[PDB]
């Protein structure tokens, strides 16, 4: 079965300095999965103000603390298992 991400969206009224957490979760498909987050095209990993964390076998969290205008942009989660891949995106707008 080909894996499929449940669409995600950032909150709609994000202001400077808030924390933002979004979740990339698999609705169809069997683990184990790889989860990868990208901002535009660069791979994101835990560090600075960012957290990228597997929450359960079906889910990856992206957390962004003390959000700034520099955090505005398109964020993509890619999930991959032995049977295929899927990708979901959403745009973070601040202030």
Author numbering: 1 to 95
Paper quotes:
Furthermore, the cis interactions were established by the three FNIII domains of sDscam, which assemble into a cross fold with a kink between FNIII2 and FNIII3.
We also determined the crystal structures of sDscam Ig1 from another chelicerate species Limulus polyphemus (isoforms α7 and β3v7) to provide insights into the conservation of sDscam trans recognition within Chelicerata. These crystal structures of Ig fragments were determined at 1.3–3.1 Å resolutions. The crystal structures of sDscam Ig1 from both M. martensii and L. polyphemus revealed a common assembly of antiparallel homodimer for both α and β subfamilies of sDscam. In addition, all these Ig1 homodimers resemble each other well with root mean square deviation (RMSD) values of 1.0–1.6 Å, indicating a shared mechanism of sDscam trans recognition within Chelicerata. Similarly, sDscam Ig1 also employs the ABED face to form an antiparallel homodimer. However, among the seven Ig1 structures reported here, the complementary electrostatic potential surface pattern (negative in one end, neutral in the middle, and positive in the other end) has been only observed in the three β isoforms, but not in any one of the four α isoforms. Structural analysis showed that B and E strands constituted the core of ABED face and dominated the trans homophilic interactions of sDscam Ig1. The electrostatic repulsion and/or shape non-complementarity may avoid the binding between different sDscam isoforms, resulting in isoform-specific interactions.
